[PDB]
C-alpha cells in the first residue's frame, strides 16, 4: 500500500508495476507496462493497494536466497509527471506498507538469536 503525502492541490499519475518471479527487473516504463501494473492517480485517490498474488512454482517457497525460488520485482514509474500549482514545494514524499493475507501461512520453526 502506497500513501501519497503531498499537497491536496498537487496532481499526477504513477504506474506501480509487478513482475512475477524469475522475470528480469523492469527497467523501462514500457517494459513494466506489459506486466501486472496499477495506474495510480495522485489527483484523485491518495492511497494505492496492489495485492501481489501467488504465482509460485513450489507450493512452499524459500525465505532464503534461492534462484530455484526467487521473488520478483515491484517498481514505480512516472505514468505522467507531478503537477503542482502556484509556488507549493516541488518535492513531497510517499510511504509504503506491507502485510499478509488470510491465505498466508508458515512452517518449520527455526531461530536466530545471537549474544
Amino acid at each position: 500500500t502506497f500513501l501519497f503525502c503531498g499537497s491536496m492541490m498537487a496532481t499526477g499519475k504513477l504506474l506501480v508495476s509487478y513482475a512475477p518471479p524469475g522475470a528480469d527487473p523492469p527497467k523501462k516504463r514500457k517494459e513494466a507496462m506489459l506486466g501486472t501494473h496499477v495506474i495510480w492517480d495522485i489527483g484523485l485517490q491518495s492511497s494505492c493497494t496492489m495485492v501481489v498474488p501467488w504465482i509460485s512454482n513450489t507450493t512452499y517457497r524459500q525465505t532464503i536466497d534461492d534462484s530455484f525460488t526467487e521473488g520478483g520485482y515491484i517498481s514505480v514509474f512516472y505514468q505522467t509527471r507531478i503537477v503542482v500549482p502556484l509556488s507549493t514545494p516541488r518535492e513531497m514524499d510517499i510511504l509504503g506498507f506491507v502485510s499478509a493475507c488470510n491465505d498466508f501461512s508458515v512452517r518449520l520453526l527455526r531461530d536466530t538469536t545471537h549474544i
Epitope: 527487473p25 527497467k27 536466497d65 534462484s67 520485482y73
Partner: nanobody, 122 residues
Amino acid sequence: QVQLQESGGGSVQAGGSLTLSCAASGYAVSRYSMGWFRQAPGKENEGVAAIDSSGVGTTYADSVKGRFTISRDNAKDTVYLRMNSLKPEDTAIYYCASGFGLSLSRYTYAYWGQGTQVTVSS
C-alpha cells in the same frame, strides 16, 4: 552478509583521473548491477554511473556524462569507476551500491558502502 569495499578514493587534481572499485561479497555479482552515488559537503544523495553485470548496458548522469566511465568485472566481483577529467564539482563523498539493477535513481538500491572521500583539488 553482503560487503562492498569502496576503494579508489583520494584528493587528486582538477582534471586528474581517479578510478574507483568495490569488492562484492555475499552474492553472485551477475544477479545484481552496481552503481555510484556522490554527495557534496552538506548536499544530497546524487547519482553518477551504473551498469548491469549481465547486460553491461551503460547509464550515466547528465552532468557527469563523458568524463566518467563505469566498467564491471565478473571474475573479481568488482566495478571500476574511471572518473577521468575531474572537476571542482566532482568533490563529493562517493558511494557504491549493488542494484536490482540498473539505473541511477533516488536510492533504488540496498547494499551501501562505508563512503570514500574524493576531493578534486584545484
